[PDB]
């Protein structure tokens, strides 16, 4: 079928190479997974040596790490917004290893509230009183307040980042290979990388 062989290429000098055998199995290639966004569909494929590979035909959830906060959560995928390799991949909404995607910020917002005890992702406050009022105060003891204001003093978020939190969507770059592992794990953009990808988005449109 599809061949990964090197011997069908012209050699370095440009001369035509003649094959000395027909296609072997170990030099095969398989059709691309073309990982779409939607309810999970994973197809198993037997590979060389009897091992197993996972084709992620459709993925709706992902595992993404903040990194700066060392907070890794299982979030959901909204849509692919930019892809460095092929522009057509964005329009067809395919998850590849290096594509960047919009992910839900709800678990990270929840962790931020539960840890730093500071409003984040909230517009003006006093809108979710049965829960936010409890989680912010908890009337906790002297030492517990001493351990909360201890983590408060270094609690800051980049301006490009809390704006995304207000929007409810975070830019994240995949780091796994869907169609090889069957997952769409990744990391949340921050800092110079986020700034650069935002400028790329703006240059593409904006």
């Amino acid at each position: 079928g599809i061949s990964r062989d090197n011997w069908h290429k012209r050699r370095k000098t440009g001369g035509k190479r003649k094959p000395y055998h027909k296609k072997r199995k170990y030099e095969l290639g398989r059709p691309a997974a073309n990982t779409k966004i939607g309810p999970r569909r994973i197809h198993t494929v037997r590979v060389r040596g009897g091992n197993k590979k996972y084709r992620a035909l459709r993925l709706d959830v992902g595992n993404f790490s903040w990194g700066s906060e060392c907070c890794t959560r299982k979030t959901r995928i909204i849509d692919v917004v930019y892809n460095a390799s092929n522009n057509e991949l964005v329009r067809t909404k395919t998850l590849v290893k290096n594509c960047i995607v919009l992910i839900d910020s709800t678990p990270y917002r929840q962790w931020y509230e539960s840890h730093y005890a500071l409003p984040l992702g909230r517009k003006k406050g006093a809108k979710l009183t049965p829960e936010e009022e409890e989680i912010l105060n908890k009337k906790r003891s002297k030492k517990i307040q001493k351990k909360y204001d201890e983590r408060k003093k270094n609690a800051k978020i980049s301006s490009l980042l809390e704006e995304q939190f207000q929007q409810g969507k975070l830019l994240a770059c995949i780091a796994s290979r869907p169609g090889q592992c069957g997952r769409a794990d990744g990391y949340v953009l921050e800092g110079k990388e986020l700034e650069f990808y935002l400028r790329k988005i703006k240059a593409r449109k904006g």
Binding site: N6, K12, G67, A84, N154, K156, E190, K192, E193
Partner: protein
């Protein structure tokens, strides 16, 4: 220019670009750490690769390539490809019947990291074998020496 000249973002994978920079560390552009490694075999890593800013995933010192196998030398012939050059290796082939020799040469496409900044045509470069970097590239420049030069008029 800068190090971001293509559609993707260039970064060393082993280096965390963001360290949660807050008021405890002065935000006066703290330098991001640079990943370098000693390659062994007596080759000293150049200071340009030590303190540079370029990103090259195929650099022997700052990239993800290991030198092993054969270490050989050549003379730079062309300098007209992106981050890779072609060298000429001249040797003698012994023809037994005539009890004599025969000048013949082999070209080699070797990878030139941006750490070696002022290599010119004719200088002698020692390269080391690495994993296949491209279709015809299997070697990586480890050291550069000038060919009776270092004085340009």
């Amino acid at each position: 220019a800068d190090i971001q000249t293509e559609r993707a973002y260039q970064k060393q994978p082993t280096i965390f670009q963001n360290k949660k920079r807050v008021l405890l560390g002065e935000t006066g552009k703290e330098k991001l750490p640079r990943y370098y490694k000693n390659i062994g075999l007596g080759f000293k890593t150049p200071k340009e690769a030590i303190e540079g800013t370029y990103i090259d995933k195929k650099c022997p010192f700052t990239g993800n390539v290991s030198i092993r196998g054969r270490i050989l030398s050549g003379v730079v012939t062309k300098m007209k490809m992106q981050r890779t050059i072609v060298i000429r290796r001249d040797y003698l082939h012994y023809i037994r019947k005539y009890n004599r020799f025969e000048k013949r040469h082999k070209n080699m496409s070797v990878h030139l990291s941006p750490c070696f900044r002022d290599v010119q045509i004719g200088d002698i470069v020692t390269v080391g074998e690495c994993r296949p970097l491209s279709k015809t590239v299997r070697f990586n420049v480890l050291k550069v020496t000038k060919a009776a030069g270092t004085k340009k008029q």
